[PDB]
Write a protein that binds this ligand. Sequence first.
Ligand SMILES: O=C(NO)c1coc(-c2ccccc2C(F)(F)F)n1
Ligand SMILES: [Mn+2]
Ligand SMILES: [Mn+2]
Length: 264
Amino acid sequence: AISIKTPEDIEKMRVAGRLAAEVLEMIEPYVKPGVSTGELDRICNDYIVNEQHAVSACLGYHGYPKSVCISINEVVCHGIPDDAKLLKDGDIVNIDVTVIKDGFHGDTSKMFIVGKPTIMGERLCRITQESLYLALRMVKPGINLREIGAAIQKFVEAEGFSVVREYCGHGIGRGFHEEPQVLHYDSRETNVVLKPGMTFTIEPMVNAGKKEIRTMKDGWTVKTKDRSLSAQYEHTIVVTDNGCEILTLRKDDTIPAIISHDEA
Ligand SMILES: O=C(NO)c1coc(-c2ccccc2C(F)(F)F)n1
Ligand SMILES: [Mn+2]
Ligand SMILES: [Mn+2]
C-alpha cells in the first residue's frame, strides 16, 4: 500500500528533506575542476554524520560502498566516488544524496556544471530540470501518476532527448523505496490517484542520445549505451490538499516550495 503520512511524519520528512538539500548546498563550492569524486564523497559523509547528525542511506545499500553517488557526463547513475576520478572543465555531474534523520528519508540530486559549459551540457541540464519542474507543477490530489510520467516523456522527447526506462521515482518515508513507482514515461500499468499526505520522489534520468543504458564491470556504474551525456535532478515531495510541497528545495531552485492550484 501507499502510506499516508501523518502531520508529525510530514514534519520529520521536512527535516530529512532539508538536510538532504543542505548537503547539496554545502558541497557546491567544492565542485570545481581538479577535485576528485572521492573527496567530494568524503566531504558529504563527514557533513552528514558530524554536522547534521544524520546517516547516509546509500552506504551499504545492496553493498554500495560510498555515501553519495556522483555521475559525470555519460554516466547515467550510481557513479562510484573514487580518488582517481577528477572533475574537469566542461563536465556535467550529478550528485545524488539520501539522508535518514529521525527514521525518515530525504532523497535529492542535482546537476553541477564544472567550469565552462558545453552547449549540449547546458541545455541537457536545463531541460532535465524543467522536466522535473513541469511534473512538480502537476502534482495535486486526484491526478494520476500516469499523466505525470507521460508529460515528462513528451517534454523531453520534444527536445530530441530520451527518458531512461530502467529507473523510476518512488514512494519514500521510513523506507528509502516505498510504493508507488513513479515512472517518467507513459505506461498502461500506472494507475495511482494522488491523495494528500503521499510522499514520493520525481527523478528523471534524461539522455541527450538514445534511451539505452549499460552497467560497467564494476557492478555499479551505469552509462548511456551510445555514450551521450545524461542528466538527472530529483526532489522529494508531499502531496498537499491543493498541490504539493517540495521537501528538498534549495536556495538555487527556481520553483516555489509550496505549489497550490486553489483560487483559481
Ligand atoms: O532512489 C535512488 N536514488 O534516488 C536509488 C535507488 O537505488 C539506488 C542505488 C542503486 C545502486 C547503487 C547505489 C544506490 C544508492 F546508493 F542508493 F544511491 N539509488
Ligand atoms: Mn536519489
Ligand atoms: Mn530516489
